[PDB]
Amino acid sequence: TKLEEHLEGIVNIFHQYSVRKGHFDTLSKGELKQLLTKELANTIKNIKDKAVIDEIFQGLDANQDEQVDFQEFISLVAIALKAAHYH
Amino acid sequence: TKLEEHLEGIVNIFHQYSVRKGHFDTLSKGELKQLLTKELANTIKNIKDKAVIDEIFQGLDANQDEQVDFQEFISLVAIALKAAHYHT
Ligand SMILES: [Ca+2]
Ligand SMILES: [Ca+2]
Ligand SMILES: [Ca+2]
Ligand SMILES: [Ca+2]
């Protein structure tokens, strides 16, 4: 269905970035920065700012292991959707 | 971006179902049923069963106002995302 395609698209984008360095199924700080700056530039304010990126990663990394896993990444999608819906 | 298109797309699909009755920006039980059965049948097992539907509803309707608002609907998106991601 159309909803299922969107969901699959989000998962695909997660991996677009997660496979690039280190573990294939988690985002490093560097991978997350790339994902945020290139994919959410029109969604989150000042995403180009280091401080902004840094607080987002910290907020997402709930077990503070320096990676953002898929379950943690769902939190970002929720932030992004709330922003998108305000549009 | 492609991600932003998927996000807008999820918002649109929420509205596709939410505009049918009552408030345009929240989902009544009947609307949620429509959304679940018509958009998530390949994602949640036994979605056609009435007890499966009712429980999803009560589970998402965290403030008990008999509507699933968009913030509440994000919970459903999280459930569905986990299913798509699963490595088999
Ligand atoms: Ca990685
Ligand atoms: Ca982590
Ligand atoms: Ca409605
Ligand atoms: Ca509610």
Swiss-Prot record, chain A:
Residue numbers spanned by region Hinge domain: 37-52
Amino acids binding Ca(2+) 1: 18, 21, 23, 26, 31
Organism: Homo sapiens
Subcellular location: Secreted; Cytoplasm; Cytoplasm, Cytoskeleton; Cell membrane
Tissue: Predominantly expressed by neutrophils, monocytes and activated macrophages. Expressed by eosinophils and macrophages in asthmatic airways in regions where mast cells accumulate. Found in high concentrations in the serum of patients suffering from various inflammatory disorders, such as rheumatoid arthritis, psoriatic arthritis, Crohn's disease, ulcerative colitis, and Kawasaki disease.
UniProt domain comment: The hinge domain contributes significantly to its chemotactic properties.
Molecular-function annotations in GO: calcium ion binding; calcium-dependent protein binding; copper ion binding; identical protein binding; RAGE receptor binding; zinc ion binding
GO terms under cellular component: cytoplasm; cytoskeleton; cytosol; extracellular region; nucleus; plasma membrane; secretory granule lumen
Biological-process GO terms, alphabetical: antimicrobial humoral immune response mediated by antimicrobial peptide; defense response to bacterium; defense response to fungus; endothelial cell migration; inflammatory response; innate immune response; killing of cells of another organism; mast cell activation
Gene that produces this protein: S100A12
Protein name: Protein S100-A12
Keywords of this entry: Antibiotic, Antimicrobial, Calcium, Cell membrane, Copper, Cytoplasm, Cytoskeleton, Fungicide, Immunity, Inflammatory response, Innate immunity, Membrane, Metal-binding, Repeat, Secreted, Zinc
Chain sites annotated for binding Ca(2+) 2: 61, 63, 65, 67, 72
